[model samples]
Target: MKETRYCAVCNDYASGYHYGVWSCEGCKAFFKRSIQGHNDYMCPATNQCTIDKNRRKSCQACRLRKCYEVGMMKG
Candidate 1:
């Protein structure tokens, strides 16, 4: 079987290499949308928001930060 790879941004099952990192469909789409548009997302709480499959949608700011932190760059 192929080795399972988790998404670097949200710890979900990775769909493929996207934007220089292994990411899921959700994160991939999010990053794409984020990069393609102007988004000034602010975290409702502390900046240290958890990024996981279930809670990935909680904070756009932290989610995007995590995506960048994990090396998801735009081409």
Candidate 2:
């Protein structure tokens, strides 16, 4: 049986390889927008925010940081 690949950022099922990394569509777009400097997301609470499929939008800063922690980088 084929195994499932989880997104490096949000721990969700991976859609495909994006920007040289395996990720979901949500994180794929978020990372793109992040590196392009289009997002101005600010965490409502502390800088440490939980990043999941349901709460991804709750904290853009933490989400972006998680991408980096997962070995994602810009070219």
Candidate 3:
């Protein structure tokens, strides 16, 4: 069976965050770096956790989620 890729943030095809869903290498890298290092950041003055591929850098929680979705966070 073939596994269909889906965005951790958006329920759509993941072609890399730069493309839309599935998040590209850039988004994946950014998320991993942020989570692995426990990077600190703000919410663009807004209190929202619905992180998108385009603007996922703002939320560490969501970024981490994306990483998990893409199989970035593991043992």
Candidate 4:
């Protein structure tokens, strides 16, 4: 069988399956942490938590959920 090639969060990479979805482990945990503690996340410009690989670190809260949104909450 062939493997998938879509990230759970951003659909960027297919490192492996973490939460029933193809995504890097980093995104998996990122969601757990963010969902656990939703606060203090900003985009630095508009002050919003629009998270992505590039701006994940900026907003821990959003980053975490972003993971779950795609598929990362079972690791």
| Per-prediction TM-score | 0.73, 0.69, 0.44, 0.52
Query: What's each prediction's clash count?
Result: 0, 0, 6, 3
Q: Report the C-alpha lDDT of model 3 over 1-75, residue by residue, as the tens digit.
A: 967776654335666444234554545556555656455544555455665646554565655655655555422
lDDT of 1 by residue, 1-75 (tens): 878778888767788886776787776777766663357776788645577763545677677777777777775
| Model 1 lowest lDDT segment of ten | 47-56
Q: Write the per-residue lDDT of candidate 2 for residues 1-75, one digit (tens) a residue.
A: 968778888867788777667787866777777864355766788545568763456767777777777777664
Candidate 4: count the clashes.
3
Off by over 4 Å in 1: 1-4, 36-38, 54-57
- 21 Cα displacement, candidate 4 (Å): 1.0
Question: Each candidate: what lDDT?
Answer: 0.71, 0.71, 0.53, 0.59
- Model 3: how far is 4 from its true place, Å? 3.1
Query: What's the CA error at residue 67 for candidate 2, in Å?
Result: 0.9
2 or 3, greater by TM-score: 2
Estimate, for each residue in 12-60, the C-alpha lDDT of model 4 and write its tens digit: 7767776777876565555555654346654446555555564456655
- Which portions of model 2 miss their true places by more than 4 Å? 1-3, 36-40, 54-56
